[PDB]
A paper describes a structure:
In this TRC, nsP3 has been for a long time the least understood nsP, but recent studies revealed some of its functions in viral replication. nsP3 is organised into three domains: a macro domain (MD) at the N-terminal, a zinc-binding domain (ZBD) and a C-terminal hypervariable region (HVR). Macro domains can recognize ADP-ribose (ADPr), poly-ADP-ribose (PAR) in their free or protein-bound form, or O-acetyl-ADP-ribose (OAADPr). In order to better understand this mechanism, we initiated a structure-based study of the Getah virus (GETV) macro domain, which shows a peculiar substitution for one of the most conserved residues in the catalytic loop, namely serine replacing a glycine in position 30. We produced the GETV macro domain for crystallographic studies, alone or in complex with ADP-ribose, and documented several conformations adopted by ADP-ribose in the binding site.
The crystals of the GETV macro domain belong to the space group P212121 and two molecules are present in the asymmetric unit. All residues from Ala1 to Thr160 are well defined in the electron density and the model has excellent stereochemistry with 99.2% of side-chain rotamers in the favoured conformation and 99.7% of residues in the favoured Ramachandran plot regions. The structure of GETV macro domain consists of a central twisted six-stranded β sheet (strand order β1, β6, β5, β2, β4, β3) sandwiched between one α-helix (α1) at one side and three α-helices (α2, α3 and α4) at the opposite site. The two molecules present in the asymmetric unit are virtually identical, with an r.m.s.d. of 0.22 Å between the two chains. A comparison of the overall structure of GETV macro domain with the structures of macro domains from other alphaviruses shows that the alphavirus macro domain fold is very well conserved. In particular, the Cα chains of macro domains from the three Old World alphaviruses GETV, CHIKV and SINV superimpose well, as illustrated by the low root mean square deviation (r.m.s.d.) values of approximately 0.7 Å. The structural homology of the GETV macro domain (OW) with other alphavirus macro domains such as VEEV macro domain (NW) and the MAYV macro domain (OW) was slightly lower with r.m.s.d. values of 0.9 and 1.4 Å, respectively. With respect to the closest human or coronavirus macro domain structures, chiefly consisting of a central seven-stranded β-sheet flanked on either sides by three α-helices, alphavirus macro domains lack the first β-strand, and α-helices α1 and α3 (SARS-CoV annotation) are degenerated to 310-helices or reduced to loops.
Author numbering: 1 to 160
Write the structure that this text describes.
């Protein structure tokens, strides 16, 4: 059984065994979590392009980086994006499990420039739970916002 906690902090300062990048399909550096990951582990982007709804792992710069591509909700229907977001987190969980990764720092996929102008924190979080529940990892959810942190914490507590 996995554990979940939430941390309001820069994901690049995480204390876990692996980190999930909120990647884009082309493997390019963009603002936010992605830029933080690229500054800290710059060689982790080599060959990281992966389709929407999948994830791709690399060991680089003494870190395990999982590039997970959630959908851009401007470019898919609502139901399609929901399916793709679910798949992205399932791909993450698969990488966690198959590589015996014991703790992981995870951002909320598709919540920023990919959100298509809708609040997706809870949508993303609930897919995160469903997927990583298949694992036994200590999951640390990273956010920047004090509003989000309490919301996520409530959600974790509601499960307890």
């Amino acid at each position: 059984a996995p554990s979940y906690r939430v941390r309001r902090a820069d994901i690049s300062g995480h204390g876990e065994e692996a980190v999930v990048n909120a990647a884009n399909a082309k493997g390019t550096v963009s603002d936010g979590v992605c830029r933080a990951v690229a500054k800290k582990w710059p060689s982790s982007f080599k060959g990281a392009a992966t389709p929407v709804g999948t994830a791709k792992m690399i060991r680089a710069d003494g870190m395990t980086v999982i590039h997970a591509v959630g959908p851009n909700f401007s470019t898919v229907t609502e139901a399609e994006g929901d399916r793709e977001l679910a798949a992205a987190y399932r791909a993450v969980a698969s990488i966690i499990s198959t590589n015996n990764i014991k703790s992981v720092a995870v951002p909320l996929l598709s919540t920023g420039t990919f959100s298509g102008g809708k609040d997706r924190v809870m949508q993303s979080l609930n897919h995160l739970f469903t997927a990583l529940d298949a694992t036994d990892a200590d999951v640390v959810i990273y956010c920047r916002d004090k509003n989000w942190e309490k919301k996520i914490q409530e959600a974790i507590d509601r499960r307890t």
